[PDB]
Amino acid sequence: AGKLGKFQMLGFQHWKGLTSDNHLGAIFQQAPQKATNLMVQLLAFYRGKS
Amino acid sequence: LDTFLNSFPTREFEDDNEYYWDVIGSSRRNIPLVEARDENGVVVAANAANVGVGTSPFYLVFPEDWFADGEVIVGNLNQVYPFRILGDARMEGTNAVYKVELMGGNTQGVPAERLQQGERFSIEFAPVEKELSRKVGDVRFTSPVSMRNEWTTIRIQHKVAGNKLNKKLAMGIPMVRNLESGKQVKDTANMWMHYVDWEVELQFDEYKNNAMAWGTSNRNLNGEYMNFGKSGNAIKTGAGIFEQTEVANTMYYNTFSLKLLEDALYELSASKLAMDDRLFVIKTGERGAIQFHKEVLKTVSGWTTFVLDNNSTRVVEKVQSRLHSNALSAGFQFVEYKAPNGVRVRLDVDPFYDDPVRNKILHPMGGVAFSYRYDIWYIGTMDQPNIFKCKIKGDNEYRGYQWGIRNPFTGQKGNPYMSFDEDSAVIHRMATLGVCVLDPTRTMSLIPAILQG
Amino acid sequence: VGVGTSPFYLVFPEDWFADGEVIVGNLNQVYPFRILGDARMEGTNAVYKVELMGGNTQGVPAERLQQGERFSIEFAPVEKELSRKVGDVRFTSPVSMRNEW
Amino acid sequence: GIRNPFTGQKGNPYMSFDEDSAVIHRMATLGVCVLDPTRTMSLIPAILQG
Amino acid sequence: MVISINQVRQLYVAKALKANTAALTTAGDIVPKADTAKTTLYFQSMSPAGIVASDKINLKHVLYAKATPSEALAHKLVRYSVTLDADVSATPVAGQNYILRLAFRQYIGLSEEDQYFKYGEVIARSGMTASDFYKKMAISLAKNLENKTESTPLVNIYLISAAAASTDVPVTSATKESDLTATDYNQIIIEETEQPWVLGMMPQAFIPFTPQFLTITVDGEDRLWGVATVVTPTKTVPDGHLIADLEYFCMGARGDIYRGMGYPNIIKTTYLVDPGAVYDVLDIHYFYTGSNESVQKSEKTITLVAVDDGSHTAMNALIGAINTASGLTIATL
Amino acid sequence: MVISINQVRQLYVAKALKANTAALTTAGDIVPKADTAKTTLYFQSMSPAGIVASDKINLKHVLYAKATPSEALAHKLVRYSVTLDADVSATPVAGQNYILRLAFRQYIGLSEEDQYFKYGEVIARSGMTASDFYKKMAISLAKNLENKTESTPLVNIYLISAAAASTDVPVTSATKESDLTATDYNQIIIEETEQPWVLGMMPQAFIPFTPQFLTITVDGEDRLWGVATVVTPTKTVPDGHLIADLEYFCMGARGDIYRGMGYPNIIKTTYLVDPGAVYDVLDIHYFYTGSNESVQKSEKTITLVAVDDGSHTAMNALIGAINTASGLTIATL
Amino acid sequence: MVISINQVRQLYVAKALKANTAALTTAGDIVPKADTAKTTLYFQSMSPAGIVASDKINLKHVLYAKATPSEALAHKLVRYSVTLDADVSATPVAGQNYILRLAFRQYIGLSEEDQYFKYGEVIARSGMTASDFYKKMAISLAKNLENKTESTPLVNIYLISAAAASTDVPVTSATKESDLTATDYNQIIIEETEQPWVLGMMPQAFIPFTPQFLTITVDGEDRLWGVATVVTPTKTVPDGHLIADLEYFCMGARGDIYRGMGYPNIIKTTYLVDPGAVYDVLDIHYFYTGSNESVQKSEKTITLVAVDDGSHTAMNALIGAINTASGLTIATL
């Protein structure tokens, strides 16, 4: 229950009973999916190749 | 030192970017007690009478809600003072209070000393009726941890005038070629660059090695390096084997003993090693080997029950001389111990622990302290090298000359791309390297206290 | 001496160390000194300016820096961004002996 | 110096400086000719410049 | 830090107590709002991004509302007083190695099967006294525990002199006997240490130990050379780190759980507590019961963490406000 | 933000100025350290983790060292004074749509080819004075610009009652005609806004704008109804949000470049800049030159920051120390 | 004594200081010359073979110019002090062999892997006090070490009495317990010696040592009896034997690099420095920078040795001259 390395940031975590998505986000199990088939290209009339 | 660093394998990487690994751990737990309270909520002092002197209820305070309703928990005296929870934990901040009464046939209660801070508790089971029973119990979960490591860079250079291209030597005194061992050697080569080349490659391998072994970090807990290079950028110095390993399982003794050593080895073995894998090979110098002999001897001295016989021990032996018909030879050494319950203690003396150049602190008992230093580099098996040398796949080392009109190194007489107006050359060589110690807890190290400051 | 990665001067009887080299006294790898700035001749005694290179913050005791301390050469570390030249190499020569009748 | 990212060269026998870096240089010349300006009329606002 | 919940928990910082919903200017400010009929209760807290109102507490579905001080959350550091058992000898034996073994549990791993032992050795001489022995033991212990190469601050070694049995003097790997001049030393205290803390990553944990002595030969017989008596703790570990990990967790229920998961594309939550302050707590437990068929109780709790100043002000006022608003009778700290 | 470097730039915060290396206790303390010879210069700084020192400055290789004031780094918010030109008419002209177009060049993108146009409309009636017109126009501008729906702040509309030509009566989409009881309004000020800022991901930017008017038939001829003139700004955006992103960038040179990247496997850098304060700055440029063939220079930048009380007391004592220590004669702003 | 060069080092002796080039009659004489504009500096020394001139010093290319006194180049002979550690016992214990062991680190082979151990032994008797042990131990050490049998002078054994406490009485292999008649002896100091020197063939070196000890038995305990502690030195090896090889090396740049290889067929060089006098030194480091593209420096040194007996009169006068001629500000010592 201590720091083995010098920059060891995580610690052994533990909870009892009913969990929550917060419990899972506090142990790094919830991440937002990146919509790869989606991309906004801002619109303008590009007068640079003129 | 070279053989030492070759005792370890290498792992090729693909970048000079910090890398991190996952560290798995253990699960089984005991929950410490914070406090106990009477039926009236009053605190339980240590010089206090029993608590549940009937089946009276009382309160147990804990630093976390780890126990469920209807579970029976036990203290340090397991099976003697069982504790059944009388509900769910009424949290007071982060502390969790529980209502509890004594199971079993206890009718005199629990003494207060069995209810003080720090006492360890655990779950036993959830006992229930067989008719009209209601839900009880719960379960638990845990999570792992991880660790990091980084790299280092080194440079060297040597400048020589251009006239050194094919310069012959008169050999007034024999010309010498410094070796890695430190031994001067006589060489016939009459040219000066033969030796310049040798020394450059030599000093660069010496650079690389001192880093892989004695690498010391300059980084801060805020994440900042604090040694700034000539460019103004920071020098990102890593840590070496000895620095990496000496963070765990290291003792600094003023006096060595077999009790000290055998307790350490056994306590560690009963905890971590199976009875069939407690063979501990120790690396040290030959001054430590003598000290091991002296300690093993006095212990065996106190073995008064047995009479040790020169027949079996052959301490004193018969040799053929001309000064006598029965000529005798006396002398022995203790090079190994065998403690109880599977512990074997052997020695593997390396001269690296005796080098008088690297080690400049001297033991008052005749030698360099680094020889009075016992290390176990591999406590058990790992299915993996715990200690290895890191190598970027392609970006390992670079070579470059910035010279004028003639290059003594390569022996090129004309320059299509001159760097300056000077009959001179300078070789530049760079390399990148790293070292990793996954588990520093799997490296035991006894060290004399004079050897730290 | 050397509080806050502060600099200070190591005097020597010889110019044996290049700038950009880490040198270690008797307590090796406990107090690493980074030679910054080539040696300045004080006659035949070489004077270097140094910087402690092991995260040291408290410095080095005045007892580790008295006459006689042995100093070895560790290596020459550099940054990976715009790094300039550091390091050097060294040579030695033998001797002879003589007898008569 | 000792390596060139533009080309991928990791060591040169002909080094230019000790620093670990690299520099690129490009140079070109150009020119335009109008034989007769009087054949080009331009009606311009007085704000761009009078 | 992950914890156990009764299906939900919420936290709101009372950095300043106002009297209206119109005075919530600065973040952290809070007011308790209740009907004059006293049928519901809620709190208007000023968030950094504006204002909020906690869930509504039906005062007839209130299970328990208790206030907790900070002394009750400050972990009390275990001390071990160590001495020479006058039964074997009130003084050291002039040729025996006095080894001490501190066995540690809950070292890096989580379990008790994560054991770890550090030692301290003193070979004693003829003219040695108890004072000199304790001094040398402390140096041996510090050089192995209070060093600057051990990854963890295992313990804190101290020395006590009979002249001042109340004053404890520290001993580090740097300490030298010349700094320890008193000739009347009677014991060696060995405390725990506040371990490294990291908001949401490294919860406040400890590593307890037992000083287990080794045997000496006093009269041709193996006998232990000392006793490890527990004494009343003297140092504590303030609760600032606990409240901040509670806020970090309880602001993932009414907020973002992807605290950093996907780094540039996150929502940065602005936590309001100072891990260097001591807070005094108030936990109100209550539930929600529905209509005819929906009788099951959805139990809830919300925590209010105000700051302490020795006296428990900033909560006795908060308590008085909630008491006059909701009629509840909560006990002051 | 990201900046252009002359091969390096280091930043060090000067929260408190001390006179010794021993007085460095708090994480913002700083000492200018030099030798009597005036041959080198360095700064001893107190970090969240221990003391640190900056690269050593060769006082013979200094290229420039100038302290900028806080005023110089505050972006002035350009503001126009919009009126109706007395040549077309000094009063509104009934039945005409007095439209007003506000162009925005650096809208969400960062190019000048990413434009955005928001409008304000007012149709005039008989008996309409100029004050009534400006009132109605400011109101229609707010409802379209200072609404609770627009993704970004765009402008700050104001009104000026000629009786008080200084005070800028503000206006927002919530403001209603009745809240404006004056009759001597003479202009519609339109000022750019501070855009939102988050440390290290959203640089401190502005959206510049020009008011474009439209035509109205006054006596048979389509004519522009107003004249937009810029006036000396009166609201400045301090540098707190600027020094802060500077630090965020220049602290990854001393330390970690993987900021928050692998969220749980990170080095959390602690920053000392308050983005709600006002710092002066002291930038010093210098270089390192080698020996006899490495004469190429390596110019390296170092800058210092210090809060401004309004009279630059912190930085003035700072450089007064540096001048007593290094012989330089930087000017006390 | 091969030294390292920053592209070259030159040495010019100064046995006399003159005002003009017309006063240079005797060799060693020297004068500094510099135009009234102070743009160049050069020295005119009278060589044994006629007048000669130093290289030219571009006075705006001077890197460092510093002097060194005689007392800063004399190697101080280090010396320990050996005694009886009063902890074990403050008097010799009868029947025990006190075998001292001096370990020598840099013996013949120019390294630390080249070790050499000399010893000294004494068996203690009942009435043997500490004074009797010290002398008998000293005579024992002298016999083994003060050997003229030895190929090298290794150490000097001296004694000290509580009466004097500074006067060190010497102990050579010739002395005997009857010559040392004092009853109050306190310690055994051990200096290191000067070794034999030969310019160009045998550079000035030293053999360093530490007086280790072996174990006596006292109460069934193996215990060291002694404590060697360095003491502030009292004697120094003067400079002359070191300057002599400096110029023997720094003359082969000015002149013949074959300082004798085909003996009959050589250019014998006349060296002005007396290797039996003391000299203060004056180093001027500078460089030559070229034109448009040839900026690569070429650093150079100009060493100057002036006999300084007692007060540093000669070199001080020399410095006043160079500072008056070149406008420099070299510090006088």
Side-chain angles (χ1 to χ4, degrees), chain B residues 67-328:
Chain B
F67 305 123
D69 198 11
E71 263 166 346
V72 286
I73 61 172
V74 294
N76 282 339
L77 258 67
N78 319 297
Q79 215 192 5
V80 172
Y81 303 121
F83 298 98
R84 204 193 61 159
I85 313 298
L86 273 65
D88 278 309
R90 277 185 47 143
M91 314 281 298
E92 308 183 352
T94 305
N95 277 341
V97 188
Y98 289 79
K99 203 165 176 135
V100 70
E101 86 194 5
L102 277 163
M103 279 275 274
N106 293 291
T107 177
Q108 304 112 319
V110 179
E113 61 256 37
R114 277 279 83 68
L115 291 169
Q116 292 300 309
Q117 172 176 354
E119 194 193 0
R120 306 153 54 177
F121 278 81
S122 190
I123 305 142
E124 264 301 304
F125 40 83
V128 75
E129 290 90 0
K130 61 176 73 66
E131 72 167 307
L132 306 187
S133 57
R134 287 156 76 61
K135 58 159 210 175
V136 157
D138 221 349
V139 303
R140 286 102 189 159
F141 309 89
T142 56
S143 81
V145 74
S146 66
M147 267 165 63
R148 291 274 272 257
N149 191 216
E150 67 193 0
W151 298 82
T152 314
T153 53
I154 50 164
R155 269 173 88 106
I156 205 167
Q157 68 91 34
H158 181 232
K159 179 189 200 156
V160 302
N163 57 359
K164 313 293 180 271
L165 196 146
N166 272 326
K167 184 178 285 292
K168 275 176 67 185
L169 303 155
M171 297 296 173
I173 48 157
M175 175 50 79
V176 162
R177 216 188 64 195
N178 299 172
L179 299 189
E180 204 195 310
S181 314
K183 181 172 91 161
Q184 281 191 11
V185 70
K186 186 266 184 183
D187 193 25
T188 53
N190 52 13
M191 290 303 169
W192 179 235
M193 315 318 292
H194 189 269
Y195 306 98
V196 167
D197 289 331
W198 186 263
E199 300 299 307
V200 166
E201 183 70 79
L202 184 65
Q203 199 81 11
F204 200 44
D205 304 4
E206 197 263 332
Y207 272 16
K208 292 170 69 175
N209 290 343
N210 275 297
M212 276 170 165
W214 324 118
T216 284
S217 88
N218 58 1
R219 199 161 188 193
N220 203 3
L221 281 170
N222 192 43
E224 307 168 357
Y225 311 89
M226 54 160 87
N227 294 93
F228 298 112
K230 304 172 171 311
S231 83
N233 303 124
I235 307 171
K236 298 188 183 189
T237 308
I241 294 184
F242 288 75
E243 285 52 55
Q244 278 183 50
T245 71
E246 287 183 309
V247 298
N249 285 350
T250 55
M251 176 168 181
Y252 285 94
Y253 70 74
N254 269 301
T255 302
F256 181 68
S257 299
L258 215 69
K259 212 155 64 188
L260 184 86
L261 177 75
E262 80 179 290
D263 212 46
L265 272 66
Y266 182 63
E267 297 290 356
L268 185 136
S269 312
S271 299
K272 306 176 182 69
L273 278 300
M275 179 166 288
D276 54 318
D277 292 331
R278 303 182 177 185
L279 171 63
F280 295 115
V281 184
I282 294 92
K283 264 199 193 186
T284 179
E286 44 186 49
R287 303 273 190 180
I290 303 153
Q291 196 176 8
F292 193 68
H293 158 98
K294 284 204 213 147
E295 301 295 289
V296 184
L297 179 61
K298 59 173 69 67
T299 61
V300 180
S301 71
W303 291 5
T304 61
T305 53
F306 314 87
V307 299
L308 298 172
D309 211 359
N310 181 26
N311 191 328
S312 65
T313 57
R314 286 289 152 92
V315 168
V316 164
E317 180 59 25
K318 294 187 297 191
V319 291
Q320 270 204 14
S321 169
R322 70 185 210 86
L323 283 53
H324 213 272
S325 179
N326 192 239
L328 279 68

Side-chain angles (χ1 to χ4, degrees), chain G residues 123-138:
Chain G
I123 190 165
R125 298 309 188 191
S126 295
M128 185 193 271
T129 180
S131 65
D132 297 359
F133 180 74
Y134 287 144
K135 61 181 71 176
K136 291 177 83 158
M137 187 71 230

Side-chain angles (χ1 to χ4, degrees), chain B residues 28 117 252 254 257 267 271, chain E residues 97 101 111 115 121 144:
Chain B
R28 284 170 91 213
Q117 172 176 354
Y252 285 94
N254 269 301
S257 299
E267 297 290 356
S271 299
Chain E
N97 216 10
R101 157 185 57 198
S111 196
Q115 275 178 350
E121 55 81 25
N144 294 273

